[PDB]
Design a protein around this nucleic acid. Structure first.
Lengths: 181, 181
RNA sequence: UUAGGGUUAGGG
RNA sequence: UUAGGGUUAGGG
């Protein structure tokens, strides 16, 4: 009886201690809901832990409640849980990078800070809003950077590439530095 | 009449818009106290802005109140203020890197999380505390990583290299990744 | 079309 | 002496 989809309910649990089994991974994350699925990824030959796994709750509400419980110490080790990234986007560069900033392209020269603030507040607490303009000329360049205080907010946004802000169909990507491009 | 030293009262203001003068830099940061010193660094020949400057309050209280006002938009641009780093440490690698994690070496096999928590809480809100141990052997390795929610907390700590925690003289350095060493 | 200015570490 | 395990992205 699961209404919400699987990917929205799934969490990638990276950095798992090599002592973590399916059972010890389940016995930890079950404190924040019921687990539809809980697996520790292993090598097909050695069956040794590959250092990451997946958990899937019945509700996305439980997924958010799980993320509200960071940090997570499973089997005596701090793990890094991340919202599940599609097998599509996982091939794209920087999809797995933990960032607190996003790229917003297509705002089209009439979008100000309050437009971004009023829209993106619904995903998390906003730190900075930078409307990119051409220096000296003052012309707006049609894209902006929004920085949140929590990386999980960014991860919830970029799974939906397209957003309609201020009457524009915009693209939202994870903010990559110049040295990662 | 300045009791506290100069370096503790000085802030490095990086990323300054090239339109920022001493006066516009002062007219912004004077909202959080009195400015002992306020300079925009320029090239000796062109006198064009080098993109950074310094401000110095009369109290470190005003310096903390200034940092509580992040982000700072000076002359229509978000600037990155940092606690002043000695001309010594500025030669050391990674001193200017904005990090939220610290290295703590010398805790010596009898220091647990609560020892680090009770000591380092006095500098800011703590996110994670990782006591580094040898896998499989369980032996403690004598160093730890402490992650704060604010980079400014880390910057206030690492200006004092040596700290006495749990009866040990420990070294505190900025957490550098493996790829920056 | 929609990728940032890391000259963003010292003048006195 | 006091530098981290980025095999931390898919099994079904």
């Amino acid at each position: 009886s699961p209404k919400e989809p699987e990917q929205l309910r799934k969490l990638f649990i990276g950095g798992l201690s090599f002592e973590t089994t399916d059972e010890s991974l389940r016995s930890h994350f079950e404190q924040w809901g019921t687990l539809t699925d809980c697996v520790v990824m292993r090598d097909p030959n050695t069956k040794r832990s590959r250092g990451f796994g997946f958990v899937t709750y019945a509700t996305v509400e439980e997924v958010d409640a799980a993320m509200n419980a960071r940090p997570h110490k499973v089997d005596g080790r701090v793990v890094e849980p991340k919202r599940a990234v599609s097998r599509e986007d996982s091939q794209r560069p920087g999809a797995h990078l933990t960032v607190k900033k996003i790229f917003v392209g297509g705002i089209k020269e009439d979008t100000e800070e309050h437009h971004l603030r009023d829209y993106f507040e619904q995903y998390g607490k906003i730190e900075v809003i930078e409307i990119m303009t051409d220096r000296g000329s003052g012309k707006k360049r049609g894209f902006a950077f929004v920085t949140f205080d929590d990386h999980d907010s960014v991860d919830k946004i970029v799974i939906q590439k397209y957003h309609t802000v201020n009457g524009h169909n915009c693209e939202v990507r994870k903010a990559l530095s110049k040295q990662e491009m």
